[PDB]
Design a protein around this ligand. Sequence first.
Ligand SMILES: O=C(c1ccc(Cl)cc1)c1c(-c2ccc(O)cc2)sc2cc(O)ccc12
Ligand SMILES: O=C(c1ccc(Cl)cc1)c1c(-c2ccc(O)cc2)sc2cc(O)ccc12
Lengths: 153, 154
Amino acid sequence: NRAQVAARQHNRKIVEQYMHTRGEARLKRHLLFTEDGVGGLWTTDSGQPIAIRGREKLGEHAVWSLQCFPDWVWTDIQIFETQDPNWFWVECRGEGAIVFPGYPRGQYRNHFLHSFRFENGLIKEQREFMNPCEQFRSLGIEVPEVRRDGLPS
Amino acid sequence: ENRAQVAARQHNRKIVEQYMHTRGEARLKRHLLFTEDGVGGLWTTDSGQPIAIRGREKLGEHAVWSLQCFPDWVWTDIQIFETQDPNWFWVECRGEGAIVFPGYPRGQYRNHFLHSFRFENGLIKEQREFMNPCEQFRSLGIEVPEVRRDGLPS
Ligand SMILES: O=C(c1ccc(Cl)cc1)c1c(-c2ccc(O)cc2)sc2cc(O)ccc12
Ligand SMILES: O=C(c1ccc(Cl)cc1)c1c(-c2ccc(O)cc2)sc2cc(O)ccc12
């Protein structure tokens, strides 16, 4: 129990560090992961995650993260510990320029949930969840509209 | 203080369990798990704004529509997360069932969901569910736009 308490307190510090990582520090965020750790975006247009698998690949991906989201900041961070000392959830927002190849530069804002699962004091699995429709908007991509006439309102 | 927090968390967890396992005709009374002014709804939609049902009475009325448009809906793969706030829980799960939206072909809708439950005085003050609307678009036959990935490596 003292060990679970210790694990939770340490893991929480890693979540805080991850969520506050911005700027050039993003180039070393992958060091918060286990060697086989996975991090990525679970909510995309395809319905499949875009997951970066392995600490080395996460470090390589930071280059592309900094290209596509050059000034990204997580804001409004609320960290939730859970009964599992190795599992945390985060509710937050994120904002920054979006610079996707072949799209106009945009300003992207979204609400996010993150899941952090730990192993031996480092992140084993990070997942972020958002509404892709807001990212479509930031890219100038038309968002389909569910017709609401027949729904209660 | 800790005893009161522990008591609140244990009770609130039972309410979350009950909510997540409410199926079929019991859905018509799910609103009784809310405070009178409780709010529940879908936070992730095509508009970017929540579709929130405000007040226990309106939640009960909305259950009628819910049972018509998602007549056999179930939540599955339910994982309930207590938090350091005895009045705040998160749930990761999936949901599935027929989707019968007005003016759209009858479909089968499956999605991954996160739910947030915030409690006041032992009942739900705020329920919010979060999903990827693209999967609901697919269930309705609505074309999902595709972000071009040619310059976007993973
Ligand atoms: O926004 C992201 C994203 C993907 C993964 C991660 Cl880890 C973070 C963001 C998205 C992409 C991406 C892929 C590779 C890359 O190098 C940078 C961005 S394609 C895509 C397609 C969507 O419908 C929504 C989001 C994204
Ligand atoms: O599926 C839902 C939904 C909304 C709120 C709640 Cl509480 C549950 C489901 C959605 C809608 C709705 C509105 C009112 C109603 O009576 C039934 C359905 S429009 C819409 C539009 C979207 O792009 C995605 C989901 C929904």
